[model samples]
Target chain A: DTKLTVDDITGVVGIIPTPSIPTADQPGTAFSVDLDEAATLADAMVRGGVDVLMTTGTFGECASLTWDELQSFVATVVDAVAGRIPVFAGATTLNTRDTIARGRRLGELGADGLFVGRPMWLPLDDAGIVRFYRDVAEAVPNMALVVYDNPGAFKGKIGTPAYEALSQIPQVVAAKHLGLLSGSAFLSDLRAVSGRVRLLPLETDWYYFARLFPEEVTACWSGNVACGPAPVTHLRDLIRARRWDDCQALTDELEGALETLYPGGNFAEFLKYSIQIDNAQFQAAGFMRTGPTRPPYTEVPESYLAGGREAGKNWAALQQRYA
Target chain B: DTKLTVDDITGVVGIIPTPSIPTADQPGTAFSVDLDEAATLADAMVRGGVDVLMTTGTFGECASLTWDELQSFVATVVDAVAGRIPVFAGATTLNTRDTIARGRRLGELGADGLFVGRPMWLPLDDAGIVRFYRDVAEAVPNMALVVYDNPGAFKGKIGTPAYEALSQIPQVVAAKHLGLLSGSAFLSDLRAVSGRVRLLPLETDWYYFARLFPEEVTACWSGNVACGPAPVTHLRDLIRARRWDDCQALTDELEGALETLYPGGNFAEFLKYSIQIDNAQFQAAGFMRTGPTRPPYTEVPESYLAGGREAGKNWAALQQRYA
Candidate 1:
């Protein structure tokens, strides 16, 4: 009963950013959110209807937080959710030993599952990947482990050979497939290995899940947990009824509205804004983390708010369509 | 008894490229010479009347070679030189572990000294560098360790604080100063810590050495090592006698000749070609061990051969002036 099984997982898995707000005087001096903020958000997600929560994972900006900050965020979120829904926390860092320490912390915090990225500077070899995953599995034997595979995480796909080897490890129960390689060759290769691993495709783009597999995809990873009662209720109805076409139409319309309100801003920021717009419950107390990305990445322009409002309107229309 | 000391380390120390020659079957393909080539060159230097030999550390393409290749190169050169003159080998790598391993190998191979660059990634604070040197000293207790202060090695300089800490390590006998900061600044810093450590200036440009501290420099690290018996012998006499004004004049004249002969070619290729022009003995034998630099660095332009010839003639004249 303690182990996470495929049947146990249901509904949209909401992702909440561990809010980091900058001080007004310093302008760019950002501080991480206190444990209270994370706990409040988790309680809201449970109230708003989320089956599982991925806490302080990559989408939660894991890289920006220190080890201690991450521990606080995970502990607070786990405590708030308290077995109402399965909680999967991120465990990743540049050093292997540091990553292992994080895994141990997650286990101790009573997280139901773990979503871990590949180790940094790991050579592009199957043996290295196998060693990394094996070490992680051994370190936290009881937790359900979902391998987070993305170009940003591993630089490339866990080679078919490596995936085959990883599947042999019992702790590796699911895979958060980012769908990086979209061709037939890659898809077939993935399907061949899917027999051993449960592949949960992440529909990054709204149109992907429904258009590709109308009958199969029922849930998604949501970051807009603050979108409140009406929209959240509609999302649940669509998933429960297996209405692929209706869900696709709703998502497409919502995405279009989101684009208008937050044009060219961080997608996550735009999503957070949507939550604020739908229900006045989420407070926007500065909530901007790092002083924009350090160079080479342009800052979010001013037009983002106006664009987000327009996107929010479209999102409202999606709720009506699905309802 | 044949090991180099502070007394004999004065003058120019030439850094030679591992001899590489092109093949007919594969136009860009070049044959590589390993430690065996280093030994052969050491023999050639002794024959040319040279008193000391330094295995061209990075300039010699040491970083590009595998562990096996590096070990063989040091062993062969040490055996061939046979304690006739002190043999100093490069012992540098990205990892501290690897550096310590190479240091142990060099000591076991009978190398009189080592030229180690800074470690990679983990930028050592002064204390860290001191600990690194101490750990390395323990690994190779007998060999004289030369901390090569190359500014360009890691895009920074080993400042006074680092030098002060490193001087405390007993086996860290001398520094191969790359003149990262101003020569005067380096001189002042070295004096500040002179009681703790000895300084050995590495004059890269011939003109700089001839004009600056002629008395201070015991031997010059030369790139013109393979330029046949006539030129090398003359260069040796000139260097041994400390003929600064004459060396300066020759260097200027030779620089012009080299510039005209190999307008676009790199200095490494020009050095090899100069050796080819000096004698039939220095014919291209496909002996370059580190393959033509890994991409973005193509072969030497064909027109540079004529320039190389002209430069060779000027080098011969310059050597005569020093002689």
Candidate 2:
């Protein structure tokens, strides 16, 4: 049974995609999830040794799904996961009321926690950002909150004072960082929060962070698990072994391999069509059948597709090597 | 009866704040529209001689209200206006499906058009922006659309290619620009859209835009109408009468008086708390009862409030002189 606390929010936290039905016309219908595939993806993450499973992230297509589809997909994932590991469902929206409404329902659907991105319609200041998280925590007291901090996705970065304020909320267990922070910036944020909110950087940066700040860098998040989770889980094991040299080797290998996948080998460029690029990578790797990204966000340029497939093949190679 | 055509979208377009209830606790309850005040605010814009009235913009607090409140507020404004001028309602969200759903409902509730900002959870490229507006136009079909282009509010700027593409959609009649473009950038965008979608600069910038490119600069949007519509309407009349000297004088006078309103006299800094600053200005002017901004966006520093109140007083003085 899973009762997720601040301590349990560690290791390789994995995110899975929501596969959609084939050739739907209208947008509301187009974004509905393929329930069976979502369940399969959840099982794959669990079997692949992830410490926690998350649904409805950006790669998970949280933006496009209808409220009903969001609930149904989370329910399907929870049933398949069967409480073996914590399930944190995405409940982000353009406003506080809608996000809280979804967060409350996701909690009832057996989600152990919520993955939240602050409303991005208007960029928020440090105080507004803190107040948003605090409001959600107070409203949905049961769900552990993982603050989604992606500056390119969210309009701006959450500064240190905001992080310090967020650390005081008991329900805020972790943050999914966008990994744009320099070594100094990360250190300042790490010091400000003081381990109360574990900052889960991308899988590539976890090695550097864990090596420099061993006790605090307890977890890393990866949507690369959508391409199969073996390599990511292996990285976690290497860190636990305190094998810094091997961790560095794997991290360098992943970073090198992933370079060709991003548009112009730039992560910022790739974020422009992240859902599509992620879908392309997962499909090319032949991991649990991530279907086409839903409409309005579906198009990918030929060059970007080339990068996505090349990166995915390399991802598959790593999965085979590690597994 | 209002049959809103593309050609009818012009002149001093004004936005009214959604007057909310007194000290409500829950967000759902907190954001409910004060119907009588909303109706009254709608009437004020009409009597003050604005060419159009818009609801649910950044100042209108579209981010904070419930679906029921949005429709109720629109219906009330529509009833109060009695079809003398068109009323456009905001229907922006984090995804296409939700936005289309709201756009369709707003249309049924008698909103002449949608004041739409693209989903902001993930920033969009040119193609993505074009596709999103196209999708909404196709879905709603009947309602005219106004692209709400505040880069500070929405994540990215809509470039020339995107505007050229949006121009093809017959339903997209105008854009509410954030007034950030340089002279050449505005010229480029104006040429690209080719007078199809009127790019509305702010009331302050309309003088330069109108004098420089007289034919294309037919209208401008003003949230300052919340203080009162007199000065803005006066600017519009001057532009139409081709009194360039008077227009320049009035523009400089209004610009000079309002300098204390913005933090650091920078519009970008003011956008950090646009809703709160606008509310404080409106409340201090004693125009309409613009109550405290809702929680999560409630706090304003003493210096900013002083700027807001001083701006409000200046705004009131202009209203008296202009009227």
Candidate 3:
């Protein structure tokens, strides 16, 4: 695996769950990785002009899938992308041994970088956590690594000291920081580590985050980006062009659309539903679109789709206008 | 399984993760249940004067155990208690159907009541959640139920109308409310359903909750209780006697002790180390003590224990003085 550097990295790398092709009998019934849908989502993200592709991540629900399934998803997506964009595969497992081994297999499967988190269920202290990452980098000396920092999903969230330590690791390229806004330490701590690696916000609301910290967080990750990257793509352009007023209006539009997409914080549960709604928009203009989420992830109930219809309509209109 | 009514349940049910005996090789390496250790913890809880014993819960790490291990722990505890106190078991599984099946099995294994929660991953709506409980109660038919409502740990937090709907379920003897302190609905919902069932707090700050609402939350659950129940038993007694100043002081005493027992909100990760700390108190007076936590849950790092020993000493002294 060639080492990844910050300069080579692309922006708005949409990280989505493994989109397996649903069985003909009933969608979301099968548990295995469906290659057709995986390729479709990969192509969707790329064709929508997303800079990079991240799979087997949090939204990817990589924890629920087996090692083989993850490998299959990574391989299929790599084939679909065909060097169109750098492909990163998430490799955080129950233990360091699995995470290290999973990274190797993902690298074997053509993932350019491994987006990994510290071992979960049990968290480590600053020094111990640092040691865990150091060990991981040592194990996969060639694999490019993106440290996942979702405190809600993984404990021992990387902070100043840990990020300082991570800055020293060679394979490490990006700090995929999440939930940093909960406290005041985000900026000062980020300033300390940005010298070592590029910083990025984890999924959604990247507009404000990347907008606020222009130099540090160069890219944004998103689940909704799998459905359509056009909105965020447009937002990124406005931010770059210094079209402040237009950016603010687009921010409002995104928030307005989000209210319906995620009511009562039903975000994780309604991910596939949001994707389907986005497909409806594309289908309204007659294009090939997506299908269902897998087993374990239930189909979005009709009531939710009905309730969030206004948001879907807002999304359709706003996306067409901005995109 | 015997028919269990609200009349049959004992109070102050202290729930603890199944603490397995460590392998001679290393701590937290093995995954098998140690009947002797299981009996020891159960007997310790009863002797320490907990009104009821709960096994295989969050503190019990119910999410991580095998069915055989669970049955083994449940069976062992039931036999160890020898009907000395009512035994409740947690039965929150992946979905409602599995939860119902698991509850039936626990009931079959001699759990007097089941401490259950709504399904995780894909949470249903208010009406769908209500239907879930109604179906479980019907399936179990005679199992006493204490609905576990730790929204931080589970989804579909039952409040207001949900509680009103749940009031119609005859088997639901109590609502094990958690993380509801952030809002006012707990009190309002309790008032609505108090006619049908007792609304109690889950393990962690039970002293304050039972202190605040003496009439409604007659009981609490805990992992710390397996270590030393005297403090909470004493706290409960003080609250009932209307000794306000003494109760407040005791509340501080309890919080002071837990600071060392749980530092950095590291409670889930440090369960085994916590057990060992309690043993030091017992060992100072010269008595046999408990064993280790299971694999996947490592022992608390020596650094954390070293860092928090000041708190640990305060806890030891405070427990000896107040407990």
Candidate 4:
């Protein structure tokens, strides 16, 4: 496998919702991956101008899936993409061995890179964090790695020192930043590893980071892309076109539409209901045939569902406005 | 694939601590199952007269293990038991599809039954609880099921109505009681499903339940048995001998030693650290070469370590007195 470099990691990286067989006649296989739906979702992302695709993150219901289901989902998505876009399959596990094992297997199944997160069972100190990434990189040297930086999902933020150390690993090409780092803290973090590892900020933060560090900020990750790809891909094109004023305006619109998405308008608190919320909104948006997020994460408060529905409708409106 | 009846579930059902190979040279495989230690632990329990063996419960660290590790542990324990006693492998997952999938696979791996708890991510209502168990039993009709009843670990207790419904499922043979049910509630719960589905209480409550309903309360599930089988097996002997006075006396002794086991003298709080506490005590007791508990669940307060150490020392002393 050809390992991707930091410079090679670019554009609107979209996460595909895990579309499952909602109601199977056998019922025992109800929540298993719907290969047809998964493939179609992947192809839709590519057609909608998504530059990269991720699978099995928090909103993707990675924890609820069995090994077989995950592998099948990865394979189906990879086949559907057919080398058009990089597919960074989720390989986060509770321990180093399992994580490495899954990363290696996912690589075998043709994942372009691994969307890796540190285990949250016991929070990792700085050294433990460095050691985990180093060990995985050493074991699977050929696979490019994307450090999944969700503070709520993985228990804590990766400190600047850990980021510096991770930047040293050749296979650690990029990181998906999902924490609420202040602008200065984010800038400090990006500066520490910008040349060696692409710190892909969320779309909302992408405008801020890119406007300040135009040379280094090349891409962003979007969970809302699960709703539809047009808005995010247009933002990507705006950034590429260096239409700074239009980028700001579009980001403002995106921000307004996204305000109703989080439960209680708190992103950190919303992590607890991420999968359910994402599913509700995605279904409402009607971009793809995303079924219910599987149990035990299948439930959210009615208010959260309402928030998600409104968010999805707003996003769908943005898609049309962008188009 | 003969299904077990309620009458077939009896005596001391012991959960084997997951004795992992600590300090693996590869480092990544550090928390994987030590099959050799697993087999020896199983042999020790059987020789000590444990009437049944269980694997992969809370103390068993089921959540931390990968699928391969779980299967290997189940196979090694079953092979070591040599059909001398039933091996109920833990098959609890976050959803119905995965639970049934795991249960069926474990049964194929020679497990006699599944030790299951309802998914705790989203708390199940009474009707949802009944449906979850029914779905699992219907999906795996040939395998016996033991309902794991840990309110803290599994969100809520199984109410009497749910128990009554579970009793009608032929494959649902027993339920492990880990909640702090009052004497009246316990009696009521036991009576609701007593004849059809054995409610196996903890060792401390075993004598009380057995004394009151000798014909029905034939077994008890012991996490303490992971420390060594002697104390729990002896408790079984006392019950079988109909030595009510000795049973009460022994129960009192057991109760005194267990007083320091829970952190802050609170079992509910301790559930958050159940795996760590159990590992600390089991290691202190020097029972089965039990290694570190593994990442994510590997940490505990210094005070918790002290409590577990003291608990193990007390349990070891009790073992000597009974021996």
Top model by DockQ, which number?
2
lDDT of 2 by residue, B1-323 (tens): 22455578779889888887776324545455678888888998898899988888887888877787788999999899988998898888777888998988888888888999887666777888888898898888888889988777776778989989999898888888855454466778889999888888889889888888888889999988978889999999999998999999999988887888789978777877787788778887778885566655665677888888888899999999988
lDDT of 1 by residue, B1-323 (tens): 22334565544454455543332112122223444556677787675666556664544545434455556777787788888777777877543445666777887888888877754322334554565666667667677777776554432467787777776666666676644234665666565555455565433343354445455444445555554334444544565676766556555554564455434655434443332222221232221232233111122335654555555555555445444
Top candidate when judged by lDDT against the true structure: 2
Ranking by DockQ: 2, 4, 3, 1
Clashing pairs in 2: none
TM-score of each: 0.46, 0.95, 0.64, 0.79
* Candidates ranked by lDDT: 2, 4, 3, 1
Give stretches of model 3 more than 4 Å off: A1-8, A17-36, A46-51, A56-145, A150-158, A178-190, A201-218, A230-323, B17-36, B43-51, B56-145, B151-158, B178-190, B201-222, B228-323
- Listed for every candidate in order, the interface RMSD values in angstroms are 16.0, 2.0, 7.0, 4.5
- Grade the docking of candidate 3: incorrect
A204-231 per-residue lDDT for model 1 (tens digits)? 3323543454344444555555443345
Candidate 4 docking band: incorrect
True contacts kept of 2: 0.58
lDDT of each: 0.54, 0.83, 0.63, 0.79
TM-score of chain B of each: 0.71, 0.95, 0.81, 0.95
